[model samples]
Target: HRRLVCYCRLFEVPDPNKPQKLGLHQREIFLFNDLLVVTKIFQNSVTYSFRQSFSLYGMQVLLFENQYYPNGIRLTSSVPGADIKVLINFNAPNPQDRKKFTDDLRESIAEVQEMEKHRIESELEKQ
Candidate 1:
């Protein structure tokens, strides 16, 4: 079973050119120990539909400065066939919450990398 570390509801900027604009989708992101799950929340109902999922192995998280969105983070992944890049805006006044969320995500990625390294070493020894 995967352990969930953090979860948040933010706006996904479909167009990076207009990150501050009104064209954004409501997304709920789940940061698990091994993977990140993104879901779309229905506008009228309390239902969430899965949008995408990415492994923490090679995912990159970046905190960028935006005049319009102070609490915004960018996630980029170089998965084969499909390259995922998304900008998430946490339209909140508190900066500490965003800082804490970024730290938690970075730590989770580090933990996954360490585990992957150990697994590769163990497998090499069996050869």
Candidate 2:
């Protein structure tokens, strides 16, 4: 395979604290086509917290304790099942970008899910 590095996309989840809270949810999609080109702006945004969209059983991961501050934010991507940390503000200064996109991260996820419905199968099916 050629050493051609692909892009790393970044989508924001505004006010990730109250995920269900509308208006507060915001998102901005970015591309990192150059792996050698590291974006310092993303240095602190190196972590993500995730809760499988749905859970019919067991305890789920969430704002363990809303202490005015949160553990970190969750980041999903265009690639299905590609859930990972996209922003890390814990134990450091908070990140605030004077700019924001009109799109919502929640909405983006729904679209991605719809597009990948064919690739998604249940655990039972795998067995």
Candidate 3:
């Protein structure tokens, strides 16, 4: 089972490529032992989970054009059937807060990659 390792929030952006809600436009991002969860809170919280196998590897572009998110990261997955892309907005309360968020995310991503890689290898053995 995946553990709740880290959590943060996705910020509001004007870009159509980014996720947006009605008012806050922010989603509660959670990193677990297995997957990354993005939850949009409203009357009921909506969630989108990115599996470790099909989630990690991607084309990531650093964004600075937006004044609001000067240090934003945009990721687009390279998986054939799944078109997955997510933009993590770094609109933190302060630089320290931002750094903490970044560190946790980095560690969680690496863990996901390891898990996914192991799973793929295990699958190949059954073939």
TM-score of each: 0.75, 0.26, 0.58
The residue pairs that clash in candidate 3, if any, are 3-33
Per-residue lDDT of model 3, residues 19-119, tens digit only: 44444556566766555566664354566643222244442334343444544545454555876556343344345545665566567667777777889
Write one digit per residue (lDDT tens) for candidate 1, span 1-127: 7898988766665444455555366667788988877787545556645677777876777766566666667776654677665534344335676687678888999999899999989999999
What's the true lDDT of residue 3 in model 3? 81
- The collision pairs in model 2 are 45-88, 47-85, 48-85
For candidate 3, which ten residues in a row score worst on lDDT? 50-59
Off by over 4 Å in 2: 1-38, 42-72, 76-103, 118-127
Full ranking by lDDT = 1, 3, 2
Better candidate number, 2 or 3, judged by TM-score: 3
Evaluate residue 46 in candidate 3 and report its C-alpha lDDT on the 0 to 100 scale. Answer: 62
Can you rank all candidates by TM-score, best first? Answer: 1, 3, 2
Model 2 accuracy (lDDT, Cα): 0.29
Which 10 residues in a row give candidate 2 its minimum summed lDDT?
54-63
Residue pairs with colliding backbones in model 1 are none
Per-residue lDDT for 88 in model 2?
A: 23
- For model 3 the local lDDT of residue 77 reads 49
